Assembly symmetry: D2
Homo-oligomer: 256 residues x 4
């Protein structure tokens, strides 16, 4: 509860209280971290500011950052650098795909939808790392969130599965790049969690019940389980760990 | 010598006599197949045509097909359908990334370069499969070519490594989609081979020397070794094999 | 039907007409190979000789070979050397574990049952390779059979899953050893097939139904599909392929 | 710091203060854990008793446990049960192979050397878990240590690589078994560290220099980096993590 004392992290991707990013924010806060939040656009600004305010302590900086927009991304981290001076990591909790691509067969994925999913769900990690690198003057960790669907075929995940494969490969190439600067890059592969974006995946309740039935720990995962693993990865306990993908999924990933 | 007797395959991605696609074409021809060739633009028409000419026992069908162009892709396979009625598979031997992206550090990859590499090197397999599906009425195999860099970090591969991870995930999701229609989808992961596109990968002679020194078979791969593995995957011998990635790389992939 | 003309292979592990080894033998024969058969003990001798006699041509050499017995393993391959002088490959189709260890929880596996499974199902590949190397003076391929349960957790497989992990790792270390001598080592990972040994695995009809319902090709594998992939791996077509594990499982391995 | 307050762990495999198990013991101690130690035989008893003394005083429970000896192993955990009643985890840091089997080509591995390596380095995890299960009534975590050589071919590791493949598969099958009882099972894959047993692996200085040059973090790993990841896996922070293999190896595992 003082593992992250004296450290500041940027948390990207809070949309509401069910967001995995908000679970991460709570765990980081509870471990003593100061937090900077970024939100996608005006629609979500008050949700994020209100949640940030429920944390006790100094008021958290809350900034707009649409990761499809290089100008805004650059400006966002320039502001951060000037206002706080040093950060020790970034939690990248961002993905998007068109729902029409998610519903159809994968072979019917639109070109524009494929590239949009790649842009937001995979390339944005690299765009973010490029700007974050400048502010992580003492090193630290960059974290992203992935899903089993990026490693193997899971139903109704389709275009997002292929985007997560890009993301997981990006984690490795970024780790190899940034390690010499003392920056680690890792992923958490979370099991299914009911979030705002989970509605894009078909019959989510069958999926949850399947986890309960078959996963080794016989229960579904929580935002807090993901956040507590994020606490480890952002801490000095994980200083030897980079380019890794830790499954926080009740062991489901081992099943064949 | 007769494994592919009576079957016709579309080979995409011949550019010159060193192209892996040309090794695949020659092997398929040696196993009794008839071949159709597509070429990327006007600058390649004559060369692809000259090579296609040297296949005895058949006349040439050689068509323009820019896989970024949906109207042309659709028209190309409609022409194929009208000319031969049924094909039994497609060899997708196509990739591209900007030189400046391949030379820099991965973290400095441009957004447009990333999406361009994804479009041409990964999404195009899906775009091709969607059209090929219409002409593969007796089932068959769709093959693509990948590289170890899509699985693990290899030097000077960067944005292409991430595009190959995307391509390999696509192979799996497409296999899952098309299998019910009797269409298999597989990759060959080739070891380094001196081709036109190898010029964009830096220090290639030393990469080859590394294979020679360290690979289990103590030698570099050839276009013909890849071609002969394609013969298998396109044949009835591989009718139980789909969603697979066969390394044709002198064993190098097993090394830690 | 001439891929393997002029070549001689030792097929180990035929027990009856449903044995995967017998699928492999029929495919290799149809491809022009001469064959040598080994059998586990006196109880199987009749079956194996009867099956071998159904092959057109000169009656195949048939020899006892308990792979737990180093004296007999050595004598067997010395007899092979005196009878045919040179062989071009070996199909290792051998496994065993106590049926109590397959039933109970894996954590209740007995020490002697664990070591017995390792001895027969994993180490025997290496013991066989060491003798085969003496007779494979022109190079060739050594093949073994594995199962998805060596990679991920499959129900009831337990101690055999751990032995297959050991087997798959042995394939890689042997490939690295023997490649410099022109010897390739590969595995086929077969999907579930009703054989004599499949009686040891619980609810087998249920397993086959799941494959039929969920596998990309919507059907279960056959001994012939495995045999035809073995033809590839034993042929010159696969001369660039070593340390590989080819799944012949209707694509099931890709599912998450 | 208080992550493990009020919890007791069994540390197996301390030989001297360079032992990875000793790095683990120190980290657990610093996180507030109470520790029980086991030693292999009388040759190492003094080392282990004295090191245990520095952390726990002369109170400490220090017990003989040759993991090849089922009587002694059972007696060990029976003593733990009636001395402390409940434990919350076990660190299994035990491996052995004959030095001859580590130098010769893998194909020359002796049968009894192979089974010996499997017995001590892989089956012991299962035999330990079967006893630990009885005293882990509040749940917890079982940890083992593995090496990249269990996944891919690393030079001069041979029979131990195959034993680590078995160990890693055992982690998965054990996790699937014990999860329903609230017990997690995980591995740490450590990078090369100069320990007592590292002498078994040839030209170790060369291996270390390789890591320093090429690993993403450009430095070799330490016992403390491993211990601190162990603290995470034994803590409530990792309650969603089971059947996982975390590489603590400066990122080296991502490289191809
Ligand atoms: N929910 C699950 O079961 C699950 C499982 C595994 C991984 N994940 C991953 O976790 C991450 C967070 O998703 P979630 O489930 O918490 O849902 P969510 O809807 O709460 O979070 C998605 C976030 O992405 C943001 N985003 C989308 N487009 C953006 C853009 N252009 N610029 C900036 N931000 C943008 C949204 O504003 C939102 O905050 C995603 O990467 C998701 O794929 C989720
Ligand atoms: N050369 C190697 O060492 C190696 C190793 C592994 C994989 N590969 C892969 O093999 C495949 C073939 O590459 P190669 O080495 O034979 O090189 P190459 O340059 O001969 O072939 C690449 C082909 O892609 C085509 N292409 C590019 N953009 C296209 C577009 N818009 N539409 C249609 N075609 C387009 C080019 O015209 C060319 O024919 C690629 O996927 C490559 O990544 C190559
Ligand atoms: N049947 C399947 O669905 C399936 C799937 C994947 C892999 N496999 C593997 O295929 C291989 C062949 O099994 P199968 O299904 O054909 O069954 P099977 O019972 O027909 O063959 C197993 C063979 O192993 C032999 N064997 C056992 N102990 C031996 C010893 N001490 N010395 C020599 N030979 C010995 C038996 O005599 C028999 O010939 C095994 O490795 C098995 O694990 C089977
Ligand atoms: N040193 C490294 O670079 C490295 C890297 C990755 C993994 N590992 C693994 O870490 C673990 C600890 O090894 P280490 O490097 O600390 O060396 P070490 O020599 O300090 O520890 C190995 C321990 O195994 C014990 N052991 C051997 N046979 C035993 C038996 N019959 N019963 C009980 N205990 C027995 C020894 O007594 C010793 O305490 C091993 O599993 C090793 O394979 C080591
Ligand atoms: O990756 C996810 C995986 C699961 Cl099981 C549930 C939700 C996920 O998150 C998303 C899914 C689809 C879209 Cl459009 C956007 C996001 Cl954030
Ligand atoms: O994938 C490849 C791998 C290697 Cl080792 C060599 C060449 C390869 O092929 C390409 C590399 C870069 C670009 Cl721009 C396009 C292609 Cl086709
Ligand atoms: O590996 C196998 C996998 C499957 Cl699905 C079915 C049978 C298999 O083969 C065996 C299973 C158990 C034992 Cl005792 C011995 C063998 Cl040969
Ligand atoms: O697994 C290891 C990996 C490395 Cl790089 C170094 C030492 C290791 O540990 C061992 C190696 C050989 C033997 Cl005989 C026993 C053990 Cl404990």
């Amino acid at each position: 509860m003082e593992l992250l004392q004296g450290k500041t992290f940027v948390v990207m991707g809070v949309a509401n209280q069910r967001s995995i990013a908000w679970g991460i924010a709570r765990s980081l806060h509870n471990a003593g971290a100061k937090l900077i939040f970024t939100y996608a656009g005006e629609r979500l600004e008050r949700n994020v500011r209100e949640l940030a305010d429920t944390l006790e302590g100094q008021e958290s900086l809350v900034l707009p950052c649409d990761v499809t927009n290089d100008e805004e991304l650059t400006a966002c981290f320039e502001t951060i650098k000037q206002e706080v001076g040093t950060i020790h990591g970034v939690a990248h909790c961002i993905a998007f795909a068109n729902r029409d691509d998610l519903k159809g067969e994968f072979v019917d994925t639109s070109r524009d939808g494929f590239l949009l999913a790649q842009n937001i769900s995979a390339f944005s990690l690299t765009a973010v790392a490029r700007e974050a690198k400048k502010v992580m003057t003492e090193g630290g960790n960059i974290l992203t969130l992935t899903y089993l669907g990026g490693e193997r075929v899971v139903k109704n995940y389709n275009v997002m599965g292929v985007a997560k494969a890009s993301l997981e490969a990006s984690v490795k190439y970024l780790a190899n790049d940034l390690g010499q600067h003392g920056i680690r890059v890792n992923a958490i592969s979370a099991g299914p969690i009911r979030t705002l974006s989970a509605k894009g995946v078909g019959d989510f309740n069958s999926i949850l019940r399947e986890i309960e039935e078959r996963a080794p720990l016989r229960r579904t995962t929580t935002q807090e389980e993901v956040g507590d693993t994020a606490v480890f990865l952002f801490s000095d306990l994980a200083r030897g760990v980079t380019g890794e993908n830790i499954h926080v999924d009740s062991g489901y990933h081992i099943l064949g």
